[PDB]
C-alpha cells in the first residue's frame, strides 16, 4: 500500500561533534582480597592481563592441592562484580580458542567441587562457575558460525541433535531444554561432546529439587569429563578437517572464528594433563 | 540407563594442547594501486590502531570511494582482507560492532550513490562481511540487561524480541525484514537493527523480493553518517546516568567493551 513512515525522527541524538568512542561507567575501586597466599595473589595478578596461554597451563593433578587457597578469591573475593564482569567480557568477545580455555578451565573447577561435595547452586558466588552460562551461549554461536561440513565430515554426525541444541541455546537460552534433549541419545560427536561438556554446569546450577533427573545426567557428564577434553577434542577435530575438507573457502571462514590465539584476560588457568 | 558416549570419539591422549590448528596465509600479493592515500589507508587498516586516526569525514568519502574501490571490490587479496575482518567482526565488543556497522552503511550508500548493484557474487570485501556484523550486533543487544530496551520512551520491546529470534534462531534476514515492515520504528534499539539488517537483506533479495529490496533501500538512503556511533553514544550516556542498578552497569560495561578493535577497518565514517 502506501509508503509508511520509516521511524519517528526524534529518535536521533542532537546534532554534535562526531562521537569516536561509547561511554563506559566508571569504575570503583576495588577492594584487597581476602587471602595473605603469595600464590593465590599472584595467580589473581595474572588472571587481571592477556598473558601467552602457555604460561598459564596449570597440570590438572596439581589443582586439587590448589583448590581451597584459589577459593578464597574464586569464592569469597570482596569483588565479585569486578571478576565476573572482567570474566563475561573475554568470554563475550571470545573466539574459539579462548572459549575452549574457558571451558576447560570451568570444568576441571567443577570437578574440584565434586571431589570435594560441594553442591553447585546459583545462590553461592563462584566467579567462574557464574559465567559458564555465558560460555555455553559463546560455544554455540562459534559453532553456528562454523561451515557445516565440520559437523558433517564426522563418523556420526548426529547434525540433528547438534542443530536442535544449538537452536534452543540461542533462540530462548532453553538450558534445561537442551539437557533433556541430549539425553535421549547415545552421544557419538565430537560436537554433541562438547555441547554436553558446555551445559553440564550450567544446567546443573539452576536445577531445582523437581529436576532432580536431570541433575543427575549432568553429574554424569561432569564425572566422565577429563582434564584438557576440550582443548583435545577441537584441536583433533581441526587438523583432520584440514586434512579432509575439499572446500576452497572453508579454511578461511574457519580460521576467523578459530582465531589466531586466545585472550586470557580472567581466565586463572588452562588445565592439561 | 543409556551409555553416555561413544569412547571412541575421544582423541588419543598425548602432548598437552597449547593452542588450536590453522593453517599459515601464504604471501599476499601487491595491491593493485599505485594511490599513495589509499596504499597508507590499506597500511592502517590492517592494524589495530586508535579509532580516531581512522576518521573520515562525510564530505571526503565520495571523492576517495572510486580510488577505495581498488582494493575493497578489486584486491587480489580477497581471502586475506575478509578474514581479517570477519576474525575482528566475530570477537567484536559493541564498541567493534558500532564502528564496522557505520563504515558499512556509508560504503553502501556510496554504492547507491553511483547506482552499483547489490549482489552476493560482486566480490566487496566490506559488504561481504555484513552479514557477519547483523549476526553480532543481534548478540550483543540480546546480552544487555533488558532495561536498555525497556527504559526507552517507547520500547517496542517485542519487535527488538522477535527481530533477535528471527536472526538468531535461524539468520531469517529476510523474515526480519518482512517483520520490521509492518510498523513505524520508534525505538532506538529497533532502529539499530533496522540499519544493521538493509544490506545483508539487500544482498540476498531475488527478483521475487524486489518489494523488500525497496524498503531496504529506503532504510540505507535514511541513514545518516555516524548514525550508529552516535544513537549507541546518547543512549548509552541517558542509561547510565537513569539506571539505578548497579549489576546492570558492571553487565553494560562488559558487553560494550572499553574500546574498539579496528583490525580491517578501513574508515570510520562521521559527520
Ligand atoms: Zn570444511
Ligand atoms: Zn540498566
Given at each position: ?10 529518535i536521533?541524538?542532537?546534532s554534535?561533534?562526531?562521537?569516536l ?21 599472584a ?21 586439587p ?7 578464597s ?27 575452549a ?31 559458564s ?13 562454523l ?20 537452536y ?9 531444554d ?5 539425553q ?18 550450567p ?13 543427575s ?7 566422565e569429563?577429563?582434564?584438557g ?16 575438507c575439499?572446500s576452497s ?15 586470557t584476560?580472567g ?7
Amino acid at each position: 500500500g502506501p509508503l509508511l513512515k520509516l521511524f519517528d525522527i526524534s529518535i536521533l541524538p542532537k546534532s554534535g561533534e562526531p562521537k569516536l568512542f561509547l561511554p563506559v561507567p566508571s569504575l570503583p575501586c576495588q577492594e584487597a582480597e581476602k587471602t595473605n597466599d603469595k600464590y593465590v595473589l599472584a595467580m589473581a595478578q595474572r588472571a587481571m592481563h592477556d598473558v601467552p596461554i602457555s604460561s598459564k597451563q596449570l597440570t590438572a593433578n596439581l589443582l586439587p592441592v590448589k583448590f581451597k587457597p584459589l577459593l578464597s578469591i574464586v569464592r569469597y573475593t570482596p569483588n565479585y562484580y569486578y571478576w565476573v564482569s572482567m570474566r563475561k567480557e573475554t568470554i563475550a568477545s571470545a573466539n574459539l580458542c579462548t572459549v575452549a580455555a574457558f571451558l576447560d578451565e570451568s570444568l576441571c573447577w567443577g570437578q574440584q567441587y565434586l571431589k570435594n561435595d560441594f553442591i553447585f547452586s546459583e545462590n553461592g558466588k563462584d566467579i567462574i562457575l557464574d559465567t559458564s552460562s555465558a560460555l555455553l551461549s559463546q560455544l554455540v554461536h562459534k559453532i553456528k558460525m562454523l561451515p557445516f561440513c565440520h559437523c558433517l565430515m564426522q563418523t556420526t554426525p548426529q547434525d540433528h541433535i547438534v542443530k536442535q541444541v544449538c537452536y534452543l541455546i540461542a533462540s530462548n537460552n532453553r538450558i534445561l531444554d537442551a539437557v533433556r534433549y541430549l539425553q535421549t541419545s547415545v552421544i557419538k560427536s565430537p560436537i554433541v561432546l562438547l555441547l554436553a561438556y558446555a551445559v553440564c554446569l550450567p544446567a546443573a546450577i539452576i536445577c531445582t529439587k523437581n529436576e532432580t533427573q536431570l541433575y543427575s545426567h549432568c553429574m554424569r557428564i561432569l564425572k566422565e569429563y577429563r582434564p584438557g577434553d576440550v582443548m583435545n577434542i577441537l584441536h583433533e577435530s581441526l587438523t583432520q578437517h584440514l586434512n579432509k575438507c575439499p572446500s576452497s573457502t572453508c579454511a578461511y571462514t574457519t580460521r576467523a572464528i578459530v582465531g589466531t590465539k586466545a585472550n586470557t584476560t580472567g581466565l586463572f588457568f588452562l588445565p592439561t594433563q
